[PDB]
Design a protein around this ligand. Sequence first.
Ligand SMILES: [Mg+2]
Ligand SMILES: [Mg+2]
Ligand SMILES: [Mg+2]
Lengths: 152, 152
Amino acid sequence: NTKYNKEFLLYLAGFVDGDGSIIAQINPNASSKFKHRLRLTFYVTQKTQRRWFLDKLVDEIGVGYVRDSGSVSQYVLSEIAPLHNFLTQLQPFLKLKQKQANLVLKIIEQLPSAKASPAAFLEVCTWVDQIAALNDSATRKTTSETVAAVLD
Amino acid sequence: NTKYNKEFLLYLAGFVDGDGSIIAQIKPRASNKFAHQLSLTFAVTQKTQRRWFLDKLVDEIGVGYVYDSGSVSDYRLSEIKPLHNFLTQLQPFLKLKQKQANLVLAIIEQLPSAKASPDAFLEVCTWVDQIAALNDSKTRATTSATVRAALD
DNA sequence: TTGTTCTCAGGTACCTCAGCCAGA
DNA sequence: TCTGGCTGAGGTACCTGAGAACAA
Ligand SMILES: [Mg+2]
Ligand SMILES: [Mg+2]
Ligand SMILES: [Mg+2]
């Protein structure tokens, strides 16, 4: 577990509050027992002309990737243990996105339980709803209600 | 000549680097001696639903104003003295917009010279050009080139 | 002749989803 | 079945100007 420098976290927390994204998704997976896969992602988006800033980020964080789309690029971190570690350290410093970070931490922490039971899974799906509500959500599709597929 | 907390400055620089803007403008004015007026702005933009964040900024910075148009708000600071002080303090922590901050500080400093002579004014105008070039400039009309209306 | 406040809006550069597939 | 790497894209929420007017 990497300990991040405080000043780095303070700047990043500001930059994240601006161009960053803390995301929770419920993906429909036919293979999964509950028919859905959870995904948690930390994203930082920037124009591709500036991707070096993102490339540096992979190095400083120590995990993750930069993906490129023509004009715009993103830093993405999805791996759960590194994500929990980085967010734990970030969240004290966030303002706009502090609650989202706390919710993500909660979900991850409760993941194993969530896997052993439909009920524990649905509760946890509600948390995802909460993160989406907090975010500027515009294109969302699958929610905890969709997870009434479990009622069938 | 307020002195700002370093932790606050670190967070804000990251935020400014993300959602913020450092703007230099040349505005054409007949009443002006060289026929244009120079403007400098520091802005942070956010959705009005989050205006509370910007209002907080006026309190923390202690100067400047918040404005709404449509469904987004802008924190703005233009007063040159306060702008010079704030930016002098902010600039060490900026990464993306560090040069723009410095170029602005220099322009302000050379203002008295800018007034005395046209050739001096014109050079100060070129600095404005650099700032705009650094920025993601998309709608700029008036330039150092426009300022060679000084051909009269 | 200058500085500053206040409003407006073009064109994205972000945000925040969606989804598929390889591997263990 | 589960997770982590990868790509695609809708709908703004930003950025970064413009300009008119008030106040000296
Ligand atoms: Mg933002
Ligand atoms: Mg940005
Ligand atoms: Mg932004």
